[PDB]
Design a protein around this ligand. Sequence first.
Ligand SMILES: CCCCCCCCO[C@@H]1O[C@H](CO)[C@@H](O)[C@H](O)[C@H]1O
Ligand SMILES: CCCCCCCCO[C@@H]1O[C@H](CO)[C@@H](O)[C@H](O)[C@H]1O
Ligand SMILES: CCCCCCCCO[C@@H]1O[C@H](CO)[C@@H](O)[C@H](O)[C@H]1O
Ligand SMILES: CCCCCCCCO[C@@H]1O[C@H](CO)[C@@H](O)[C@H](O)[C@H]1O
Ligand SMILES: CCCCCCCCO[C@@H]1O[C@H](CO)[C@@H](O)[C@H](O)[C@H]1O
Ligand SMILES: CC(C)C[C@H](N)C(=O)O
Ligand SMILES: [Cl-]
Ligand code: NA
Ligand code: NA
Length: 509
Amino acid sequence: REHWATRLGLILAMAGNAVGLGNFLRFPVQAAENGGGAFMIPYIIAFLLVGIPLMWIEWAMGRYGGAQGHGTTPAIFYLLWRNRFAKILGVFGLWIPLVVAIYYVYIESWTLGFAIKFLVGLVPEPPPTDPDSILRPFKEFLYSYIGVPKGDEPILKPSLFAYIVFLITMFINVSILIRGISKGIERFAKIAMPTLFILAVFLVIRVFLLETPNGTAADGLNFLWTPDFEKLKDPGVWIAAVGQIFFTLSLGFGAIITYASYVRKDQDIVLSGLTAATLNEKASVILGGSISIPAAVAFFGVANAVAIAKAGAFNLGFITLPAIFSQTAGGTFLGFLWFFLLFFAGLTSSIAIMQPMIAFLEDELKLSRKHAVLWTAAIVFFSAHLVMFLNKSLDEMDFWAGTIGVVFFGLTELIIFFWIFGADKAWEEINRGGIIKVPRIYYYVMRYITPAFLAVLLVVWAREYIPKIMEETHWTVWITRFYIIGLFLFLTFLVFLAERRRNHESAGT
Ligand SMILES: CCCCCCCCO[C@@H]1O[C@H](CO)[C@@H](O)[C@H](O)[C@H]1O
Ligand SMILES: CCCCCCCCO[C@@H]1O[C@H](CO)[C@@H](O)[C@H](O)[C@H]1O
Ligand SMILES: CCCCCCCCO[C@@H]1O[C@H](CO)[C@@H](O)[C@H](O)[C@H]1O
Ligand SMILES: CCCCCCCCO[C@@H]1O[C@H](CO)[C@@H](O)[C@H](O)[C@H]1O
Ligand SMILES: CCCCCCCCO[C@@H]1O[C@H](CO)[C@@H](O)[C@H](O)[C@H]1O
Ligand SMILES: CC(C)C[C@H](N)C(=O)O
Ligand SMILES: [Cl-]
Ligand code: NA
Ligand code: NA
């Protein structure tokens, strides 16, 4: 089996795994929609009560599984719980990263696409003061690119350039993943990460220098870092904060697990898991949070920033922020740095969410790494046409695999590892090989607090939120719903073939 070559590569591969588009696109929207400083409180607690503990658990499962030649959850879930239902529950660990991959890679490609058009200076030319005459040319720039519907039909019509950049993007993902852990994901993570850090620093600095009749970047920082204890009681704020902790630290995607399974059996995972998590939360709160919001608040003042955040998720990153940059000298280049930064951030995270399925085709179905990568690209590339041409298809997947799936799977891997497998055997397994050990208090946060926190979350969710989505959506949602349910049975079928081949291989030995 393959292993990470250096302690550094591993840590940067894991930090690039987590540090993605969620840090620079999702976090900003989420923190502003949810009252700025009023979101930061739950977010910090959630990081201490859910974030860190699950990070460790997944590394643990990962290294544990990897040692015995398995890097995915259908296998590993069976090793922790010798039951047929563990393989099935373990499927979600290939399903989630696959579905998410299907729409992540596409979005990631956009940034490449925009990155290229801003470099070359093929970008809208806003008429040099009216906020709309400026924002509109860019709304149309995005709307043309991805192909937003103009009439009554839920049909996206992607530009050709977009489509072909989606090919290159796939190609670029494959060229890394096909070289493997150490010579691919690892070699790349050592270049990407520093680059990502520099670009973001440069942007953060340049943004801090923004001033307008309407404010300064400072006002954005205040808005973001001013406590509002009159929300703490809002369950929407806690479901917001926790949903953001998961996505950002790649928990419940089975990606941490799969990566971790390339960690040598003896290698520490306590100081490593802790370093990777702490990297993702700096990049998140220090960098991601100091680019979008400050710039928006500095040009529009807070009241309008918030209104934009709520407008959509991509309004800020793909429309507002470029439009703002366009009102500054070389703001086109700056735009390119902005998108070139996003790209690398989405590239390092998309290679991560595609490795689970790969690791399964090699591990369980004994395919070469090459065929594994190729087929995994074909499944994602084919399926991505759904996302490309079906309006709000992305939104549906991001909900079932990227929102509901992750939380349910997180609680699930926690209940299998710490409750079924064994709390003590889990503790012993997490701490084993550590450079540092785990704060004794955390044992009790993992065994009682965490699972009760989440369990409650999911309960409120299934009551005060999910009924609206099942009933108040358009009818096309049932196409994607049909498709991603179809993917699950397919995965369920390979898990079936894999256990069969194993039976034939045990008999033939
Ligand atoms: C392998 C599965 C293929 C199924 C259908 C392929 C559709 C390709 O369609 C292409 O996409 C672009 C985006 O709008 C357009 O620019 C092109 O004119 C079009 O040929
Ligand atoms: C990284 C390289 C990507 C290049 C792919 C070219 C995409 C083809 O796109 C075409 O180009 C023209 C001009 O820009 C437009 O007039 C056409 O409407 C468009 O279909
Ligand atoms: C459920 C998802 C199905 C994806 C199949 C999409 C097939 C591509 O469809 C084609 O693409 C072009 C661009 O919009 C159009 O010019 C063509 O008229 C259309 O035939
Ligand atoms: C479910 C997602 C799939 C979206 C595909 C959108 C493509 C729209 O393409 C349409 O297809 C028809 C059938 O060949 C043609 O008769 C139409 O002229 C054409 O506009
Ligand atoms: C509710 C979760 C809070 C997490 C913060 C934990 C900080 C570490 O806590 C420390 O770790 C040591 C080992 O267990 C103890 O010896 C110390 O008394 C303690 O101060
Ligand atoms: C699906 C994961 C790779 C997402 C990643 N943690 C991000 O914040 O973008
Ligand atoms: Cl985050
Ligand atoms: Na990333
Ligand atoms: Na992240």
